[PDB]
Amino acid sequence: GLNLIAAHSHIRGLGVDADTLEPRPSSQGLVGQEKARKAAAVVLEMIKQGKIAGRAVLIAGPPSTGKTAIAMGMAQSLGQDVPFTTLAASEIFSLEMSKTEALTQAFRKSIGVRIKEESEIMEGEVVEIQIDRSKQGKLTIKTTDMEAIYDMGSKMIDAMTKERVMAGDIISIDKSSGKITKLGRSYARSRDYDAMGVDTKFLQCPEGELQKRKEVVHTVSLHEIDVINSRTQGFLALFSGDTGEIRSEIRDQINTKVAEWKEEGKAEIVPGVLFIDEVHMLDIECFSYINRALESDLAPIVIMASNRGVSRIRGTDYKSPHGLPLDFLDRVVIINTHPYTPDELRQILSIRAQEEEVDLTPDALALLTKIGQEAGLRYASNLITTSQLIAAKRRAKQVGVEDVQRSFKLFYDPARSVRFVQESEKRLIGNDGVVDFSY
């Protein structure tokens, strides 16, 4: 369908024994990284238990060591039941709001408010409207399965007039609010006219009982309640963005009321996760805010990933490990992801080939594993798709070594590319702009 195959599509969960939290050598698509998966599972336990507010966990390791994959597996294993805000650090450098507001919003996104509600909605096809004046009227509605006549009040006849409700229309009436909505017209009326207006759409007739009392569970972010209270129709800003640096006194009211809802049992607070990928792209002004942001009772658990060594923090000229302030790193616990052995590469490349529905020969998978050792996991992974397509060009049944060899011949790995850049430095634009275009 519309979901194509991606880099983390094979990641289906965190792959641990739910009893002992012991990882197993592969499951749910993950391979190796056992201590990191066990640590991630220990974090996932305290996410799900939810009482521990505002912990910060850093996933640290070289490129292509499963830091993002583990973050995906944790989100899959956490399920839909808990908020999982996924934020690239680049997203915080907004032009429409300050970086602290952009962090505040991402924090607010990660706490759910859960409400369960029952409401009466009457839905059906209009059969007739009848009106008397001397105000009163009668409404006939059908489903496929019922027809009934309802007395309409004066305000209800006005609403019918304002909405231009005809026979053959499908209407819904929320009895709790009283407001009519028109869903469309019944497809039976497809022959009622020769030409139809732009805003007209056909529907199947509603089915079953006319008025239903479904029980529904609602979970909304604290960020959604903020944006809804930002302005008179702030809910539209949930989609266009188009929102200010929201006033702190609005959030102050909202937090106080959400506590009342939890005291009264109207709602359950569902604290979730914020995952900040490439957190080293934040700056000293972000990090010093995040220190205070983690102080709140309504702070999520924050996961973050970095591949930086000892490297300069942004917004300053001194270096530090991970590119992060030591004042910040003091508040963090760190999970380290290691390189992969050839046997763990051989497994991951098989999992990718299955997800990509590529039938590697055993020799191709062996050669592809050597490339993964010699040229990196992502490059050997990217040769799978390339060798499949090249095999298809020769109508081959399976990807042979010759299809991987040609894939390796056509597309350079990073190291072979850097070698090419060094070998042709005068033909390439240098860091001082010099180049020679001649032969």
Partner 1 sequence: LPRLIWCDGGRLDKPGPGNLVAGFRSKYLNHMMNIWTPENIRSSLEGIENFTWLRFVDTSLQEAYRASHTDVFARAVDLASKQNRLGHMQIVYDEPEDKKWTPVHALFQICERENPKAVA
Partner 2 sequence: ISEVRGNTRDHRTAAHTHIKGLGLNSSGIAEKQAAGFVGQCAAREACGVVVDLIKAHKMAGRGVLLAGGPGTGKTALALAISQELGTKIPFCPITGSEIYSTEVKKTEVLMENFRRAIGLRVRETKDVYEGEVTEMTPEEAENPLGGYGKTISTLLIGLKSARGQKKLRLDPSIYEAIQKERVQVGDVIYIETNTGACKRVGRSDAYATEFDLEAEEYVPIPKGEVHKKKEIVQDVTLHDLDVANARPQGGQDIISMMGQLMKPKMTEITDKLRMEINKVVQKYINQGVAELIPGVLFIDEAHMLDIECFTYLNKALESPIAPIVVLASNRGIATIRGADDLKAAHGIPPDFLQRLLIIPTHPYEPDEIRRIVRIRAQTEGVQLTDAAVDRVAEHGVRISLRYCLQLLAPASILARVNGRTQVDVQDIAEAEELFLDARRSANILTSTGESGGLHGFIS
Binding-site member from 132, 134, 164, 362 for partner 2 (CB under 8 A): 164
Q: C-beta of 119: minimal distance to partner 1 in Å?
A: 7
**Nearest to 304, CA basis, from 103, 112, 97:** 103
The secondary structure of 140-191 as a DSSP string is: EEE-SS-EEEEEE-HHHHHHHHHTTPPTTEEEEEETTT--EEEEEEEGGGGG
Does position 7 bind ligand ADP by CB under 6 A?
yes
Does position 236 bind partner 1 by CB under 8 A?
yes
Does position 76 bind partner 2 by CB under 8 A?
no
Binding-site member from 24, 155, 201, 212 for partner 2 (CB under 8 A): 155
Separation between Cα atoms, residue 332 and residue 56, nearest integer Å: 5
Does position 273 bind ligand ADP by CB under 6 A?
no
340 labelled as ligand-binding? yes
**Nearest to 214, CA basis, from 117, 104, 126:** 117
Whose Cβ is closer to partner 2: residue 362's or residue 421's? 421
Q: C-beta of 145: minimal distance to partner 2 in Å?
A: 18
Q: Is 59 exposed, middle or buried (0-12, 13-18, 19+ CB in 10 A)?
A: buried
Binding marks (x or -) toward partner 1, 194..223, rule CB under 8 A?
----xx-x-x------------xxxxx---
Whose Cβ is closer to partner 2: residue 362's or residue 426's? 426
Separation between Cα atoms, residue 70 and residue 277, nearest integer Å: 12
435 labelled as ligand-binding? no
Q: What is the pairing mode between strands 319-321 and 310-312?
A: antiparallel
31 labelled as ligand-binding? yes
439 labelled as ligand-binding? no
Separation between Cα atoms, residue 439 and residue 427, nearest integer Å: 9
- Residues of span 291-320 touching partner 2 by CB under 8 A: 291-292, 294-299, 307-312, 314
Does position 226 bind partner 2 by CB under 8 A?
no
- CA triplet 305, 306, 309: central angle to 5 degrees? 160
For residues 300 and 48, is the Cβ–Cβ distance under 8 A?
no
**What six digits make up the tokens of 17?**
């024994």
Q: C-beta of 331: minimal distance to partner 2 in Å?
A: 6
Whose Cβ is closer to partner 1: residue 61's or residue 272's? 272
User: Quick one: which segment of 88-96, 113-121, 295-303, 403-411 binds partner 1 (CB under 8 A)?
Assistant: 113-121
Does position 127 bind partner 2 by CB under 8 A?
no
For residues 53 and 59, is the Cβ–Cβ distance under 8 A?
no
331 labelled as ligand-binding? yes
Does position 32 bind ligand ADP by CB under 6 A?
yes
- Residues of span 258-287 touching partner 2 by CB under 8 A: 262-268, 271, 277-278, 281, 284-286
Position 303, amino acid: I
Rg (C-alpha) for the chain, rounded Å, is 29
Whose Cβ is closer to ligand ADP: residue 41's or residue 165's? 41
Separation between Cα atoms, residue 256 and residue 260, nearest integer Å: 6
Binding-site member from 90, 94, 98, 119 for partner 1 (CB under 8 A): 119
For residues 307 and 118, is the Cβ–Cβ distance under 8 A?
no
The 8-class DSSP code of residue 399 comes to: B
Does position 371 bind ligand ADP by CB under 6 A?
no
Displacement of CA 46 from its chain's centroid (Å) = 21
Does position 259 bind partner 1 by CB under 8 A?
no
- Given ligand ADP, partner 2, partner 1, none, residue 6, with its beta carbon under 5 to 8 Å by kind, binds partner 2
Does position 223 bind ligand ADP by CB under 6 A?
no
**Whole-number Cα distances in Å, 350 to 186, 356, 370, 382, 411:** 51, 10, 13, 13, 21
For 156, phi and psi rounded to 5 degrees? Answer: -70, -35
Does position 8 bind ligand ADP by CB under 6 A?
yes
Whose Cβ is closer to partner 1: residue 209's or residue 402's? 209
**Whole-number Cα distances in Å, 288 to 99, 284, 321:** 12, 6, 16
- Given partner 2, ligand ADP, partner 1, none, residue 228, with its beta carbon under 5 to 8 Å by kind, binds partner 1
- Residues of span 375-394 touching ligand ADP by CB under 6 A: 377-378
Separation between Cα atoms, residue 329 and residue 351, nearest integer Å: 35
Binding-site member from 25, 63, 342, 414 for ligand ADP (CB under 6 A): 63
Annotated binding site for ADP: 7-8, 10, 31, 64-69, 292, 331, 340, 378
Residue ranges in contact with partner 1 by CB under 8 A: 80, 115, 117, 119, 163, 172, 174, 176-177, 179-184, 198-199, 201, 203, 216-220, 224-225, 228-229, 232-233, 235-236, 238-239, 250, 253-254, 257, 264, 266
Binding site for ligand ADP (CB under 6 A): 7-8, 11, 29-33, 63-69, 348, 351, 377-378
